[PDB]
Amino acid sequence: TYTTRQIGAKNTLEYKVYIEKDGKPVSAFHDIPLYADKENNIFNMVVEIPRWTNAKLEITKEETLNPIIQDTAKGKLRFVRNCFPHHGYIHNYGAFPQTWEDPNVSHPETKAVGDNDPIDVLEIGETIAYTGQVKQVKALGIMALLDEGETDWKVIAIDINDPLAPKLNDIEDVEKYFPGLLRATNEWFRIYKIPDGKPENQFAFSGEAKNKKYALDIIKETHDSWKQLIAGKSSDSKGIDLTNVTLPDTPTYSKAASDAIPPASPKADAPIDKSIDKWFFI
């Protein structure tokens, strides 16, 4: 049983969300198994941002036990802007634990280094997720996003408890039941940061969403990359905090990291500035 420990009021600089393992804080990047069912390829996804929300909550690499915190830019809370016809994030967005997009290396398909973070998952179920929630999903395909020149693969997946779960098994089913969702995913990731001064993103494979096989090859590679990492054999760890509480053969393993963590102090959500409302017509 994975739960959540909320410290602070959502939408504040102070807001932290730690994942708990049967009541004890674990590392959201390290102590949560990639696979819930390896045989079958059922993955564990850590949800960072709920669908149609704007706060840019992220699993923080350099904090101990990598809590999910809102990203900041120039001292301020970061929020993604609404770009017509979309309203915030159009997917439940998060990542697969125990994966690492090697910054030190130029993945051969996209020809650019990874973006230094857990691989990214777009979860397309019909229920809006919650922050710090662990969900079991099935990968259906993958997109090669080059986000600011950096390899940043987007894995398309679905909550296995989703009513259509059974009917979706490969990328081509995405278009049969969620027609146009895959083209909106291409357009959303090309332009979301334009209202921020960033250039427009680009996709490898001409925006081709790769199938479950290819995707599965990519999650493994990334998962192997994390293996070199938490083990201690990465060429450059970039100062990621490797503290964990469940991999005992690791240099960085450390029980008591968990007792170290402060109790939940959940507070009512802080309000978001009315500028976030703005709808951009890009």
Count of chain residues binding its own copies (CB under 8 A): 21
Q: Which does 2 bind (CB under 5 to 8 A by kind): its own copies, Mn ion, none?
A: none
CA distance 235 to 232: 9
Residue 86 binds which one of Mn ion, its own copies, none, with CB within 5 to 8 A depending on kind?
its own copies
Q: Which of 102, 117, 123, 162 binds Mn ion (CB under 5 A)?
A: 117
3-class SS of residue 223: helix
Segment 79 to 138, residues that bind its own copies, using CB under 8 A: 84-87, 90, 126-128
192 in catalytic set: no
Residue 152 labelled as part of a binding site: yes
Q: Which of its own copies, Mn ion, none interacts with 241 (beta carbon under 5 to 8 A by kind)?
A: none
Q: Is 170 annotated as contributing to ligand binding?
A: no
Least distance between its own copies and beta carbon 40 (Å): 26
Exactly one of 123, 152, 162, 241 binds Mn ion (CB under 5 A); that residue is 152
Question: For the chain, first and last CA: distance in Å?
Answer: 43
Decide if residue 279 touches its own copies (CB under 8 A).
yes
**What is the DSSP annotation of 163-210?**
TTGGG--SGGGHHHHSTTHHHHHHHHHHHTTGGGTPPPPEESGGG-EE
Structure tokens at 63: 């904090």
Closest C-alpha among 51, 47, 96 to residue 68:
47
Q: What is the DSSP string of 77-88?
A: E-BPPEETT--S
Instruction: Give the residue numbers annotated as catalytic, written as ranges.
Output: 89
Binding residues for Mg(2+), as ranges, are 115, 120, 152
